[PDB]
Every structure is written in C-alpha cells, then in structure tokens.
Design a protein around this nucleic acid. Structure first.
Ligand code: ATP
Ligand code: MG
Ligand code: MG
Length: 1700
RNA sequence: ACGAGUGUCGUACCAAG
RNA sequence: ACUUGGUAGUACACUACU
C-alpha cells in the first residue's frame, strides 16, 4: 500500500527466479490485501483493529471472571470480535469474489462456537464481511450485524495489488509449475479437522515396537514432535529448528565422512567388458541348467510358428469344391508307412465326394438357404466342408490313434479319475541354447525360411492400404512406398496373410461340432488347408481350437517349416505336408489374426532410412517375432533391453543381472537363435562404446542452435546384419519389448507365483530383519538421525507459509466438501467388502482332491474341482469377502448411515480411529513382462485414509498435480532438454574460466539412470512416521489419528483369492516346502499378515518425497566432496515414483575422472541405502551423454523418444468396442507418435494399417457386408466421415494438431476453397467464411449437403441418438453416431446393492415416475451426479436406467468381443431409433449396420439444410475457436520454401497457447456452472467462468438449441394432450450432452512437440510443424501470406567442440 | 500333439445303455 | 472303455495415481 511496501514487492518480483519464490510473493500479496481491507473496514466500523485473535483472549476480555483453565475455547483464531449488548459478534475479513469460502467459514465457526456459546449462556453471532475486489461491494451474512450497523461504506482501492499480481503472473505465466502452485489459494480458515486425538495410539503394539527401536532421546523427540502445535506456538518452526539443531552434529559427521571417501576411491568400477559378460553368462548357464530340464534333441522343439505354408498353384482353380476334391485325392494317395499314414488316408477317403460335385454344391446351397448327414459318394456331409467320421472307412485302432495321440482329444484321464501316478512331476523342458548343434539347427531353419519366403508370390500387389493411402505414402517418402511394395511382393506377406485368413476361417466354424465330425478350412491359397478337429464351442469359457495344416507342393523341400511339421509324404502329382496338431486359445488366435499389421509395421520401422540393412533379413526376423504367441520370446525381449543398455553403459551391474536374474526360456528354435543374437549384442556392446561421437555445439550465450549425437552409421546392428546409428541402435534395443504379446499368463500358475513372491518377501522380512535403524547401510534399514535431519531441512524449505499450505491442500482435494464430489470415491473401480456373502457366491456332493481336507463322511464321494461351497467347509477360519464397485459401496455406506453429509475430511478422521483392521486382496496385472506384477485391492475405508495421507504428501512433491503416476507427461522430455542445456553451458563456462589462467582443469559429465528394487515391497514404513510427526501443517490430534491409521496399516492382512485356494485344494500331493501352507497355518485360514510391504502403489507421493530427500543428501555429499577438490559441481536430480535421473557435471584437476565416477556411484548406492531404498541392478546404469528418464531420452541435449512403441501398441492393443472407437484410439496413437518424432511416411503407413485393420474386423472392406459406400451419397470412402465407417481425409498437420476433429475441419476448408470467389481464394479464413452468405444451397452436391447435414444436426445438435439416452449423464454422449451393443453381465450387476435397490424401485407402482419428475425439477443432477446424500442416491438409481452405463459396469473381454465380430457378423447390434425417438443372446441390438445406414440416410434426407445452417456450422466449428482459425489459416496461406536437412531437434510447446483457448475451464466445470446457473462453484474461478458461461450462452442462443427444445416439448405436449416426463427428461439430457460436446470440442490438448527448430511465437510453431510433416528426408521453411492469428575443443571426458 | 509350468492345470461337461 | 442323446457367451476381471 505504502511506497516502501510497493517498491519492496517490485524488488521481490524482479529478483524472483524460481516458482516457489513467486508463490510466496503471491501469498504475501493476498495477505497484504486482506490486512488492508481489514484495517479500512475497522476504521469504518469505529472499532480497534485486531487480526488473528485467539478465542481464549476473546473470552477472557469479555469474561475476565472465569478462569482460563475452566473453559475449553475452540481452536479457531477469529480475525476480530465485538461484544456489545450481551451479544458477541465474531468478524472475519474476506477479499474473495466467490461466496463458497465465506459459506465454509461461517459453517465451521458456527459449529465450533455453539458449544462455548451454550456453556457461557451468551449468544455468539458469526458474521463474515466479504469485499469483492473488482466490484468493491460489501457482503455481510449476519442480519443482526446489518441492523446494528445500518450503513457501512469502505471507499478503498485494490488497483495496486492488481497491478502487482499482474506483473507477477506475467513474469511467470509461461511456467506451468507456478500456475498450479497458486491454483487454490482461496483462504477459508484454519481449524483442526477433528476435535480430539487418539489416546490409544500411544498403546499400540506397532508404536511400542517403533519406540523401543529408537534411542531414548529420539523417543523424547518423537513424543514432543507429535504433541507440538504449530498454530498456538509463538513460531511454527520451533520444533523443526530444535530437532534439526539436535541432529546437526551427526548429520554433518555423516556428510563429511561420506565426502572424504573420494580420496579412498580406487577408480575401478563395474565396467561391462566382455570378460565380465562371459563370466555372467557362465553363471547364468549353471543356474538355468540347475533350474530347468535341458534337452539336446531336436524332436523336443516347440513350434516357433504354429503354421506351415507353401506357395499356391497358378494352374489350379481356387474353387472350394475343386480344392476339396484335390485335397481328398492327395490324402488318399499318401505313400509309405508311418504312424498316422493309415489314419490320414482314411480321413481323405471319408471326404471324397468323387463325381457328385454338383449334388454336393446344391446340398450345401440348400443348407445355407434354410443336422442329418447326407451320403455323397463315400462321404457323410453335414455342412459345407464338414464331414462326419465314417466308421466303415477307418479302422477303430487308427481312429483312436489319430484322435487321442495326434490331437490330444480324450487321451487324458479326467480330474476326478486321476491318481497319484497320473500326476507328472518334472522341471520345464527347454532346448540347450549353448549347444552348437542346436544353434546350427536354428540357423538352418532360419536360412530355409528365408530361402522359401523371399521368392515373389507372382501376383501384382493390390489391397486396401495401397488403394487408400499410396499417394500420401509416396509423397511423404518414395523409399517407404517402394519398401512396402517389395514387402507386398514377397512370400512373407502372402504366408502371413494366408495364416491370418485361415485362422479366421478356422474360428468361424468352431461353434457347432460333435465328437464324430471334422471340418475343412480354406484360404486364398489353393495349396493350404486346415483340418479342424472336434472341441468345445469357441464362445465358451477357456475354449481351445485344435487344428492341423496340410500343404500340397510339387517339389519337396519347398515347404515353410518353422518347427511345426509332422511329416512330408509323396502323393499323386507331388507331395503333401502335414503339421502336428495345435491347440490355441482365443487370445493367441487374436494375435495370429492381427499379425499382418504388426509384421508390416515392424518391417517398415526396422528398415526406415537404412540402406545397409537388407529387407529380406528384416522380414525373416519380423515374421518370427510377429507370429510368436508363446512365453519363450517374451522371456528374451524384455531382458534384452536392460542387458544391452547396461553392457553399453560406462558402469553397470549387468554381469550380476545375467548371473542371478536373467533366465532365458528356450522351447523353440527361434528362441535359441534370438538368445545367440542377444549374447552377441551384449558381447559387442562395449566394443562400440568408443564409436559414439558428439556433434559440434553452436551456442551464442542465448540459445544452442545445434547439439546432440552425430548420425553416423558405425554401430553394429543387433537383430540383423548391417550398420546402425545410435538412435537406430536404441530403437533396435527398445522396440522388441513392444511386440506386446499380453494376456499370455495362465492364472493357474501366475497366481501361485505371485502369492509365493509376496509370501517370500514377507518371510525374509519376518526372520532375517531384526533391526529397523542402522548406520552402516544395512539392507532394509534407515539411518535414523540422517533421515530426521533431512526431513527437518526439507520440511523447513517447503513450508514457507504453513497456513496457506494447509488451506491449499484442503481446497485442491475438497477436504471441506462432501464425499460425493470426489472422483475417486464415486468411480466405477473395484473395492473390497468384508462380511457374510454366502448367498452371492454360492450360485451330488463332491469331495476335495486334497487328502488333508476330507472327512470320513466324504471318503466315499466323487472327487470334484473346488468351488466356494467346498472351500467354505474346508477352512475353519475363512474370512469371507466380495468385490464390488466404488460408487456402489459409497451408496451402501450412505444408506446404512456409516457415511454422512459431513465434510469428507471429518469423516476420514473419524474412520481413521473407527476402522482398525484392514484387508486387501490381490490379482495379476496381466502385463507383457515375463514375470507379472501383483495388484492389491482394498476396502473403501482404506481408500479414504490413504486418500487423506497421499493428498497431504502430494502438495510438497514437485510432481505435476494434474498428471497421474502411471502415465507421465511428455513435458519431462522438455525438462530434461532444459537441464542438459545448463549442464552444457556450465561445462563450457567453467572450463574456459579455469583454463583462462593457464595441471589443466578437466570436465566430466555423469548420468545415472536408476530404478529402485522392490520399491513398495521392501521399504521401511516406519520412516514415514517421522514424516507425519515432523509435519508443521498438522494439529496434534490430526497427527495422532494419522499415526494410529499407519499403525493399523502395518497390521493389515492380505486375503488369498478364492481361485488360488481352489488351486491349492486340488493337488492330492503335498508340496515339499510350501510357503503358502506355512503362512496360512497349513491352510487353516485365507489371510496372511503383511507388515513391511506398503502395497503396490498405495503411497506413491510419500515415497517420492522421501526419495527426493535422499537425493538432496546425495547432492550435499557430492558438493562437499568436490569442495574438497576445489572444483566446480552441478547436480540435477529428477525423481519419479521409484525412477531417478541424476546428472553430475564436474570441473576439477586434482584427480582422474575414473576415481570420481567410482566415488559417485558408490555414494549413490550408499545414499539410496541410507533411506531404506536399493538401486535395481536390472535398470540402473551410468553413461556420459544418454539420459533415460521414464521412457524418454536425452542424447547430449537432443530430445529423443522411441515413437514406434506408439505405432506398435496401436496394432497390438484393441478393445474391440466398435469400428469408430477402435479407429479413434488408433488415430490418437498415431498422433502421439507424430508428436514424438515419427516421420510423415511412417505415420501415414500407421494410419493406413489402422484403417485396414478396422475394416477387416467389422467387414467394412470393399464388397463386404458392412461396406457403406452404396448406402451414402459418396463415390469413395474418403467422402464419408470416419464416424460413419469412412476413411480419414486430412493433412498430417491437422491430425497432429486436432486429431479426431481434423476430418470435419478439412472438409469445411475444402468446401470454402471450392465455393469461395476467385478474388478471395487466398485470404484469412474469417474473410472467406463471411462470403458463405452468398453461397447457393442448390449449387451444392449431394455429398456436400449430406455431410453438412451431419455436421449441423449430429455434431452441433442431437437429432438422432446413438443409443437409448434415458439414464445417461451429460458426458456419456460421444462422437460415435453408430455404436454397437456390448456385454451386460448379469453376474456383475447382481453383486451391486444399489442395483438391487434400482430393481426394487423399478418394480414399484410409480417409483420411476417420481424419480423422473425429481430429476426434471432438478436438471443439474444430469450434469452432476449428486452433491449430497439424497441427490447422489437418486442420481445413482436414475443412472441405472442407462443401458450404456450398465455395460460400463460389465465385463468386456477383448477375446470374446474379437470372436463376436467373427461368429455373429450378421447379428443386429445397433440401437438406432431415427430422429428423437420417432433365449436372447447376451449381445443384441435393434438393427444391423446396413439397416442403420439406410435409416440414417432416410432420416437425413428428411431434414432441411439452409444457408443459415451453413453459417452456423462455420461459426461454431471454426470461428468459435482461435486454434481452429489458426490451423485453417496455416493450411490456406502456406508457402513452402527452401528444403533443409534435419540436423537437430528441440522440444517445444505451442507458445502462448493460453491465448488460443476459448474456454479456460474443463467441460465438466462449465456444464456444472451452466446447469446450476452460478458462475462460482467449488473448483472454479468466478470471473473466468463468467466469460466461459458467456461463450456457452452465445453458442446456445445462436444455434437456437433451447428455443427448438421448447418448441418440440410444446408440440409433443399438444400431440399427447398431457405433460410427458420422459420426453422432457430426454430433451434435457440431449441438450446438456450437446453443450458438453461443444465445450469439449472447444479445448485442444496441444503438448510437447519434437520440431527441427526452436519456436518463439505461435506462427513459428505452426510453420515448423507444417514444414516438418511434408517429407521424410528434409523439412521446409514455411511462410504465410497473411497473419494466421571460431571453434574450440573442450577438455572434457565426452570430448566436444563448441563454435562460439 | 499343443498351451502353461523348476505348484499337481487345460487337454469340453452331463445322462442313459 | 465304447455308442446314443442332451448342455455350455467372456479372464465373472481387476487399482493406486487424473
Ligand atoms: N500398475 C501399477 N499399479 C500400482 N502401482 C504401481 C503400478 N506400477 C507401478 N506402481 C508403483 O510404482 C512403483 C514402481 O514400480 P516399478 O514397476 O518401477 O518397479 P518396483 O516395484 O520398484 O520393482 P523392480 O524395479 O524390482 O521391478 C511400485 O513400487 C508401485 O508403488
Ligand atoms: Mg522398481
Ligand atoms: Mg520405475
């Protein structure tokens, strides 16, 4: 306010450098504003200015008689008080715009002062005076106060504070860190969350164990720290300062002792030289031979690929009947004697229709038009290519031999009949990869496959990919087009396509089979056939398909045999090759079907821009990797990454990893081949450590124009013969891990493995860990005094304003609001319930197979597989549990009065003491790792308590609040680059400053990429106790309650899942050393107590904070050690959950770099160990120039990412929800790959493959059943929107910027160019849109009118519903016009309490009518889902009406949906009902895709399109958003310039993207404010939401949405004659869904791009983005007609030259 | 045979003769 | 063991971080 204060604030702003200081300045500015307003208001009220007066002082002033000890004043600290006429007024000053903080403060003060008002028999009136800073208006809630002061005027001015805040925000606007550090600074009040503490915490056995471990002074320090109150104390930091001073001596001694070790370093670290790799390999081989059964016989090999293939015959015909006759005659003529020759000959005999081909065809057609076999000549025909076994034509012994031994059908004994001798005990059998003969055989197989499959298929390439995207691919890169065409020419492509098609045909006929029948499956190849043997229905649970491949070939040895052949036999006119029978499940068949796209993607990714590589060599490896559906290759791909990276690194423990953990699993020959490849790569990795080089650095004191790694091909290729660049080397290292064959774990074994892992960790902790604290870096211990001192220092540094920190934590996480407003407490995720659930789970008696659990009554009983009923009788101490949904659990708890309308933090504090005994269960994640990770599911109450703890710990972390731990943002890729920049500059200036005097000072760049081993499983949870006691933003009662919760959490019990217990109860033989039985008291109970494991991912943020403290200690040690050498050091540490990236830049001359590297690595390990952490030797390594943070690379300043992992995943993962959904996910993945550096041609190839695979899945290819070309006014698929099963037509720049909306934008831009007058062809898009008024609607074409009608009535409006919208919320509508139905699992819904309530209300006289009218009179319950108890419970019951909502709660197994798209292509699956509503299978709909097309076209033709409609389209698709306008202008006004080579890359976000955002808030917040008609809501800034609501109201008014809704409602009411609740509710739902979709379309999540140059303006970003995506080999300088809106070498270990 | 596995599994199930 | 008849929609599946 005064001159000195304002200039001091200016000085602080100008001298501010970090975001934390800016946040402190903002807090100080807010406090100064509040103080100014309070002083001026006190002047107006003629009362003495008091601020933050303790309530006890108030009472003593008004009641001096009462002793202060007698009265227990509330722990509030009111701003002011006024006691007159026996009335006490409590006055609080507020300078906020919203009234939410005032309401919260009033409620809290009222409920905390009512007690003391009652005891003293004096009324206490709570009055909050709030001034609005922009309108200067006073708001007073109290009517008595307003009577007592009739007129209050405060003529003041807040302009100075506004300008100061504006300057501060301008200086820090482009900092994302600053924006979210001051996001929720609306101060409500400071009050404890609970009135009382937890006295029984001090008597907890866990607390007593924790206390007895520490020394007596530490016990006293902890006791006084828990009891310290930072709000009544004279200073908030007295406790922290005292404890820091106490621990300072030992902390300094530890730091000095660690730093002095630099002189004791020997310089010898763990270098990955070839001798070390050889020793590790020998130890690994010994370990594997110990743990596996090693076979040197080639007959023991498993199929590398489960297919045998041969080339087709051009002479023969591809007719099915002729192929069948040829196959029968070839099978009948098998020559020689063999085990199954008679069976095969008889099988051919019983399918030889002979001369009666016409009768066979007519019988098959008659069957198709409309089962008893029909006797064709020596054939019993049941269907097309289905034949019954003829017992007259085959001998019984041969039939049994063929069905039992060859196919494994009925050979085994049933589980009930199995004896002890029937059980097999043996180690898994794998091939000897070291054996020279085995490797030679694998090499022979690879060479033979390359010989056969390299030949041309003889057919001209013609397919969907070429016909749809060949021009774009050729324009982006002609070399990519040539490579793809050569791939299409080869026999690799024909073989893999034949395998995929034959697999689809085998699956399509796997429904109706009988034991005495077999089927023939064919493909486009006339020489390849499949015999399908009887099995269970494929749609059933865990069903398998069993088949054998037969190939006819004229010349022997022309058969493709990847270890699958059974035999080759001479037959009439050639040879017939038969493979062994193969059983596969649904997921492996899905992998086979989707293999061709993966093969193409892998081939094009590996061959991209590498003339040294040979395409045939790449294809030979890619066909084996793409068609690998077994664990053998998964056991090799992931270890290869870490092994090769660690052998490449300067220092790593790769030898120990190979010796102890690397376990190759080689059951196939390709596994032996790949193992040899990995061994050679690891051997040669350290040899080429020398051949990596650095670019010359062009820096000009303001930016570094050129940097990175030289793109010279001197490294040896890993999987192929050839040479690669370092980037290509890393790509070859990392891509094979992303050949994701997920879902290959079997629960039978993986559940036991996970249980064994958890229980073994728990046992090792139970018996081998006796001490908690240590000073010698003992494993799983913490240095107590170092931990305490570090926590004190970091808490002091991060708690500048403790009141505002507490307020921000409360505001961000909705502590003072209802539980129903938290997303994680109302979600559809799973949680656990403990209780009696016999009825839910129990849905001729059997005896258990295990002999230990059989009573004398059950001795004479049939053995059966264990179920829940059988498990109940076996276990005495069985704790019953069930899994439910989170929202259902919340509904049940609210219904049973466990949870109330109280603020959520009060309920959490209550539950921390009420809920004492915790339960968890586990399941397998199902990831592509060779060993799966376990995932723990807990209860609702555990979720509440952990929510409170994690939200407290999250604020102090440096992590971005709005991102998840599971998916780190790409912004890290930028941050790393920034760090590298400084570490380069620091290296340049320090070396030049020290060498100016000239024994020469030398530099060193060190980069530690580390992961922690068993981050949650092996941790000291006790170290977090001190984190809560020392926290200065917590009251003592809150600390006691949280510590009580943590003590109870250390006593948690893991529940073993029922499936695992079923597995263990069916064994019949005891396990020799059964850890599971030992932990469960010989299966007495299903619960095991877990003490030191905090569970997978429950404490991410707390652990991250402690990890950051450990890195701070490491930095301190390094700085002191370098100070001992009188050198310069720069340490930068990036910390994620357990991932670390530490960069060290050192300039010194005392000693050699090797000693410094050894010392730094030893100190890193010791610093991790001192805090209870251990570095993972599998993922920890040290380099000079390669930074590896979470999946992101920095190659000496150049950002880098393996973008192929985004492409491959798009092929690999499919949810099979629907055509448009799958296409949208794949296109989003392609856009993500583009942002990460994908060349344009590869992106176009990815998009083409995505479209082709989507069309294959849903029969949308040209000429197929769901082909939409004939139903719509379109000549090509390009003319149909992708939402209507069309293909995407948009420039790659548009896809990169606006992914899914690119099609509509590009169509609108094309329409503008076609109908814009010639004088305005090249102008701003605003000027061209203005002339749309001059367009003639009759001049438009049918396609243009049809697409414009879609845009007007289906995008900007809701004229036709994709599904039944009753029960849907405002966000459930998407962009999908046609949506297939999915599963609605009846078992999943029967487990929901709220679902039973919904059924009860549905079967009631008029309950649903009352619910609908309640929803209608409160329409914001459609946008929200309830903000209190009653509204949430009504909204849940209403939401149960939605069929789409019940499908979201159901199980959508991707394999079952994949076979659904194969078996039931013609089934109606679409719920399409025209314009605004004008035993059955599990999945069923109203109409099919073609019927949907016809109804959609018929209803579109009835609509009317006018000029005003086109104006509305152009105004609210393009003109509304600054981004869309910018993109349109860039496309229209683009001029490409001179070509330029791509040399260096930079990470850049679109500059000033905040000015390109129309709506600041999220769609949910905007819709909440609009539906409630209030600008200020819980998580919104009132001023910004005012203009957001202005924009939304403009959209609603100009498009006549509400007026048309009212007219429709009135017309319907007139037609019916009475008010219709359902119609009006549906109309409101449609209106809110349209508003939500508009607001969502407004926002674009532009993020970090990798671009050839740095961008400083929005135009620069657009030009770089556009010029980058034209050609692969080079990029163009792009200009716009109008506005769119001296060399020196450095003396360092990584040698480099700077051109300054 | 095939899938899985240094954990006994899948390799359809039931009834009648 | 073999013959005939009947039955069978999913891994009833999944979390902590938005
Ligand atoms: N899928 C997940 N679900 C829950 N928490 C997870 C998940 N993935 C990672 N986390 C959390 O992040 C941490 C890091 O786990 P990560 O996969 O890096 O390995 P780790 O468990 O530390 O073990 P290791 O390095 O020995 O394999 C976990 O300990 C857990 O807290
Ligand atoms: Mg880890
Ligand atoms: Mg990690």
């Amino acid at each position: 306010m005064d001159y000195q204060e304002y200039q001091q604030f200016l000085a602080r702003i100008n001298t501010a450098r970090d975001a934390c200081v800016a946040k402190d300045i903002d807090v100080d500015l807010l406090m100064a504003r509040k103080d100014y307003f309070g002083r001026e208001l006190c002047k107006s009220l003629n009362i003495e200015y008091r601020n933050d007066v303790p309530f006890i002082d108030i009472i003593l002033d008004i009641r001096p008689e009462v002793d202060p000890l007698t009265i227990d004043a509330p722990h509030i600290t009111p701003d002011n008080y006024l006691y007159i006429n026996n009335v006490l007024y409590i006055i609080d000053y507020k300078v906020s715009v919203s009234n939410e903080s005032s309401v919260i403060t009033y409620d809290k003060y009222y409920e905390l002062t009512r007690d003391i008002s009652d005891r003293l028999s004096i009324p206490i009136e709570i009055v909050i005076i709030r001034i609005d800073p922009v309108s200067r208006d006073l708001h007073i809630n109290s009517d008595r106060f307003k009577e007592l002061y009739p007129t209050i005027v405060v003529d003041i001015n807040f302009n100075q504070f506004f300008d100061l805040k504006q300057l501060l925000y301008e200086k820090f606007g482009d900092d994302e860190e600053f924006l979210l550090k001051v996001a929720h600074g609306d101060f409500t009040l400071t009050a404890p969350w609970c009135k009382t503490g937890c006295p029984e915490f001090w008597k907890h056995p866990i607390y007593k164990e924790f206390k007895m471990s520490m020394p007596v002074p530490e016990r006293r320090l902890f006791e006084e720290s828990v009891k310290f109150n930072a709000y009544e104390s004279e200073r908030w930091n007295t406790n922290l300062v005292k404890i820091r001073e106490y621990t300072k001596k030992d902390y300094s001694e530890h730091i000095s002792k660690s730093a002095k070790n630099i002189f004791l370093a020997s310089g010898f670290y763990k270098q990955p030289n070839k001798n070390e790799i050889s020793e590790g390999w020998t130890l690994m081989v010994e370990r594997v031979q110990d743990q596996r059964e090693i076979s040197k016989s080639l007959h023991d090999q498993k199929p590398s690929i489960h297919f045998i293939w041969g080339a087709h015959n051009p002479g023969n015909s591809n007719n099915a009947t002729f192929k069948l006759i040829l196959l029968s005659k070839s099978l009948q003529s098998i020559k020689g004697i063999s085990t199954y020759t008679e069976a095969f000959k008889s099988l051919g005999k019983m399918m030889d229709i002979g001369d009666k081909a016409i009768e066979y065809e007519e019988f098959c057609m008659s069957l198709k038009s409309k089962l008893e076999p029909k006797q064709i000549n020596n054939a019993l025909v049941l269907w097309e290519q289905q034949f019954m076994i003829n017992n007259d034509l085959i001998d019984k012994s041969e039939k049994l031999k063929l069905f039992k031994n060859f196919c494994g059908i009925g050979k085994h004994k049933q589980f009930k009949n199995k004896m002890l001798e029937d059980l097999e005990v043996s180690k898994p059998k794998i091939l000897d990869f070291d054996d020279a003969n085995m490797y030679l055989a694998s090499l022979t197989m690879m060479e033979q496959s390359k010989k056969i499959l390299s030949k041309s298929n003889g057919l001209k390439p013609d397919n969907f990919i070429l016909n749809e995207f060949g021009s774009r691919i050729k324009d982006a890169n002609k070399e990519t087009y040539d490579n793809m065409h050569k791939i299409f020419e080869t026999g690799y492509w024909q073989c893999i396509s034949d395998f995929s098609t034959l697999m689809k045909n085998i699956l399509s006929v796997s429904q109706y089979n009988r034991h005495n029948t077999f089927r023939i499956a064919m493909c486009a190849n006339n020489n390849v056939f499949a015999i399908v043997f009887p099995s269970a229905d494929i749609k059933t649970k865990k069903a398998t398909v069993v088949y054998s491949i037969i190939v006819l070939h004229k010349e022997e040895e022309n058969i493709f045999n990847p270890g699958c052949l059974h035999g080759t036999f001479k037959c009439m006119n050639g040879y017939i090759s038969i493979s062994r029978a193969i059983r596969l499940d649904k997921e492996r068949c899905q992998r086979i079907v989707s293999s061709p796209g993966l093969f193409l993607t892998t081939c094009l990714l590996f061959k991209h821009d590498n003339p040294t590589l040979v395409m045939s060599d790449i294809m030979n490896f890619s066909i084996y990797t793409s068609l690998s559906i077994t664990k053998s290759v998964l056991s090799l791909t992931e270890p290869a990454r870490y092994m090769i990276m660690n052998s490449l690194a300067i220092s790593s423990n790769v030898k120990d990893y190979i010796a102890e953990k690397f376990s190759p699993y080689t059951k196939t020959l390709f596994s032996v081949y790949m193992t040899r490849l990995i061994k050679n790569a690891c051997f040669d990795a350290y040899d080429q450590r020398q051949r990596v080089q650095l670019r010359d650095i062009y820096l000009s004191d303001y930016d570094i124009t050129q940097k990175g790694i030289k793109d010279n091909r001197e490294l040896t290729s890993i999987w192929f013969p050839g040479s690669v660049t370092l980037k290509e080397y890393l790509t070859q290292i990392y891509l094979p891990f992303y050949f994701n064959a997920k879902g290959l774990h079997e629960k039978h074994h993986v559940m036991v493995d996970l249980a064994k892992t958890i229980l073994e960790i728990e046992c090792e902790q139970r018996e081998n860990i006796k001490e908690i604290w240590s000073t010698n870096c003992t494993k799983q211990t913490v240095n107590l005094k170092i931990l305490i001192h570090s926590l004190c220092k970091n808490l002091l540094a991060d708690t500048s304003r403790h009141n505002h920190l507490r307020n921000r934590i409360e505001n961000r996480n909705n502590f003072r609001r209802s539980i129903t407003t938290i997303s994680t407490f109302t979600s559809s995720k799973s949680c656990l319930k403990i209780g009696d659930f016999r009825k839910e789970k129990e849905l001729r008696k059997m005896r258990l197979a295990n002999p230990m659990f059989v009573t004398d009554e059950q001795v004479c009983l049939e053995v059966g597989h264990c179920n829940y009923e059988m498990l109940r009788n076996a276990m005495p101490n069985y704790t019953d549990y069930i899994s439910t949904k989170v929202f259902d659990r919340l509904y049940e708890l609210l219904d049973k009065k466990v949870l109330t309308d109280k603020p959520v933090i009060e309920q959490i504090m209550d539950m921390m003491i009420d809920h004492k005994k915790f339960y968890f269960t586990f399941f397998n994640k199902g990831q592509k790792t060779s060993k799966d990770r376990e995932i723990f599911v807990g209860e609702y109450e555990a979720k509440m308590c952990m929510y409170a703890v994690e939200r407290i710990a999250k604020e102090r972390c440096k992590l971005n609040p709005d991102e998840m731990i599971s998916e780190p943002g790409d912004g890290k890729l930028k941050v790393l680059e920034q760090k590298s920049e400084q570490e380069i500059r620091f290296l340049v200036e320090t070396t030049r400053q020290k060498n100016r005097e000239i024994g020469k000072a030398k530099g060193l760049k060190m980069e530690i990429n580390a992961d922690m081993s068993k981050w949650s499983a092996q941790d000291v949870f006790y170290k977090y106790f001190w984190l809560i006691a020392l926290d200065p933003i917590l009251y003592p009662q809150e600390k006691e309650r949280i510590l009580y919760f943590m003590c109870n959490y250390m006593d948690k019990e893991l529940i073993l899942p029922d499936e695992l217990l079923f597995n263990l109860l069916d064994q019949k033989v005891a396990y020799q050393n059964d850890i599971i039985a030992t932990m469960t008291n010989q299966l007495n109970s299903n619960t095991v107590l877990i003490k030191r494991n905090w569970l997978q991912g429950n404490f991410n943020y707390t652990s991250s904070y402690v990890h950051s403290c450990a890195m701070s200690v490491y930095k301190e040690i390094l700085k002191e050690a370098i100070t001992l050498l009188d050198g310069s050091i720069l340490v930068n540490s990036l910390v994620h959950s357990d991932d670390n990236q530490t960069s060290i830049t050192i300039v010194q001359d005392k000693m050699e770099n090797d000693k410094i590297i050894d010392f730094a690595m030893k100190e890193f390990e010791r610093a991790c160990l001192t805090f209870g952490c251990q570095a993972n030797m599998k993922k920890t390594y040290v380099t000079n120039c390669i930074k590896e943070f979470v999946s992101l690379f920095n190659l000496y300043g150049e950002p880098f990412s393996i973008y192929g992992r985004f492409l491959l995943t798009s092929v690999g993962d499919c949810a099979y929800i629907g055509p448009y959904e799958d296409l949208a996910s794949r296109i989003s993945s392609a856009q993500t790959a583009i942002k990460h550096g994908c060349p344009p041609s590869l992106a176009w190839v990815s998009i083409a493959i995505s479209h082709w695979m989507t069309s294959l899945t849903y029969n949308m290819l040209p000429g197929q059943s769901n082909d939409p070309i004939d139903y719509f006014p379109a000549e090509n698929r390009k003319d149909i929107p992708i939402e209507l099963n069309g293909v995407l037509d948009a420039p790659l720049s548009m896809i990169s910027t606006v992914g899914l909306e690119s099609g509509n934008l590009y169509f609108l831009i094309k329409l503008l160019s076609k109908y814009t007058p010639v004088m305005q062809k090249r102008e701003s898009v605003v000027n061209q849109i203005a002339e749309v008024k001059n367009w003639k609607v009759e001049d438009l074409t049918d396609n243009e009118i049809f697409r414009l009608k879609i845009l007007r009535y289906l995008v900007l409006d809701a004229e036709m519903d994709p599904s039944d919208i009753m029960g849907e919320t405002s966000d459930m509508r998407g962009r999908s016009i046609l949506t297939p139905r999915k599963f609605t699992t009846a078992g999943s819904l029967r487990k929901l309490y709220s679902f039973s309530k919904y059924q009860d209300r549905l079967s009631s006289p008029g309950g649903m009518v009352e619910l609908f009218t309640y929803l209608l009179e409160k329409p914001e319950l459609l946008v929200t889902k309830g903000e209190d108890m009653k509204d949430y419970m009504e909204s849940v019951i209403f939401r149960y009406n939605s069929k789409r909502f019940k499908e979201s709660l159901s199980i959508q197994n991707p394999a079952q949906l994949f076979i659904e798209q194969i078996l039931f292509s013609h089934k109606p699956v679409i719920d399409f009902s025209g314009i605004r509503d004008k035993k059955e299978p599990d999945i069923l709909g109203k109409v099919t895709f073609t019927e949907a097309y016809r109804l959609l076209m018929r209803d579109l033709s009835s609509l009317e399109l006018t000029n005003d409609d086109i104006q509305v389209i152009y105004s609210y698709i393009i003109l509304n958003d600054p981004m869309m306008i910018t993109i349109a202008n860039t496309h229209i006004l683009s001029i490409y310039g001179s070509p330029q080579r791509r040399m260096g890359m930079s990470c850049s976000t679109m500059p000033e993207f905040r000015n390109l955002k129309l709506i600041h808030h999220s769609p949910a917040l905007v819709l909440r404010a609009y539906s409630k008609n209030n600008p200020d809501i819980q998580g919104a800034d009132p001023t910004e939401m005012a203009r957001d609501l202005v924009h939304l109201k403009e959209f609603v008014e100009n498009t006549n949405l509400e007026e048309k809704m009212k007219v429709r409602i009135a017309m319907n009411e007139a037609e019916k004659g009475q008010r219709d609740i359902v119609f009006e509710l549906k109309e409101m739902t449609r209106f809110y869904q349209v508003c939500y979709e508009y607001v969502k379309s407004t926002e674009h999540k532009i993020k970090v791009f990798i671009l050839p140059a740095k961008s400083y303006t929005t135009t620069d970003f657009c030009s770089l983005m556009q010029g980058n995506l034209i050609k692969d080999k080079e990029w163009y300088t792009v200009h716009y007609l109008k506005q769119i809106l001296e060399g020196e070498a450095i003396h360092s270990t990584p040698i480099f030259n700077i051109y300054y």
